[PDB]
């Protein structure tokens, strides 16, 4: 494993184009905001990139299988399903990965959602 003490920062575009960059800095400069002028393909122009102040029970294979088999603690999965549903997804038209929740017989034909 790596023993690097360097902090991980996250630069976001000022254009609200959902563009982000990845870099590193020293740990001493904790209270220092990084600002650069990088290329933004979302607008085909040079825009500002500012450092963002980016900040849970993890689900494993074992846990998943247990849940799926026994049926205990299904709310963890149901929350993800609700999130997905809320977000643009499960659309009938213009969708191949997950056009529908399940088939008529109650099956998930798309292996990769």
């Amino acid at each position: 494993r790596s023993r690097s003490k360097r902090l991980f920062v996250q630069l976001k575009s000022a254009a609200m184009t959902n563009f982000c960059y990845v870099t590193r800095k020293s740990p001493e400069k904790k209270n220092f905001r990084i600002a650069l002028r990088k290329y933004d393909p979302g607008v085909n122009k040079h825009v500002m990139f500012y450092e963002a102040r980016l900040p849970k029970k993890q689900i494993t294979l074992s846990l998943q299988r247990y849940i799926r088999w026994t049926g205990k603690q299904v709310k963890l999965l149901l929350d993800k399903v609700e999130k997905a549903w809320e977000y643009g997804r499960f659309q009938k038209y213009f969708d191949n990965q997950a056009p529908l929740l399940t088939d008529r017989r109650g099956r998930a034909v798309p292996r990769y959602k």
Binding site: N96, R111, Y112
Partner: protein, 156 residues
Amino acid sequence: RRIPKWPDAWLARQRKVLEPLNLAKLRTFIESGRLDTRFTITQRHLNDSRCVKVKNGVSLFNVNDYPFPYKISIEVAGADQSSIDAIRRVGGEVIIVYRNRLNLRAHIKPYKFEVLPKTARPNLEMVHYLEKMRARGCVVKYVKPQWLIDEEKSLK
């Protein structure tokens, strides 16, 4: 176990691909006389001539943008831009009609049905595809819905 996953493979493997048909084979068939150019050629004639076994829809594609010498009015479900341009340059025609799984069977094998079915309405995807091909320049034949007419009356 070393190379990562590749969903793109098995996602596109389950796609329903239309049956391709090169224009050179059609030209050879016309020269041999298997197909009659005096009338409009259709999938019924194409299947009965043993040219291409039609199962879900014939598609036309050209190679090296070769021009078409003859002039014909073919009826297929889809065609490439090069084929459309080559056929239209001489004065040919490409007609597209909407047919579902049942209707295609009915049309290709009318003898199999005591009472012929009724044409079904298209969905959003098929309507978009038909309108897209109309811009390409294929004569589309299908019933239009009310929501499109209403919207277009104002859009124009």
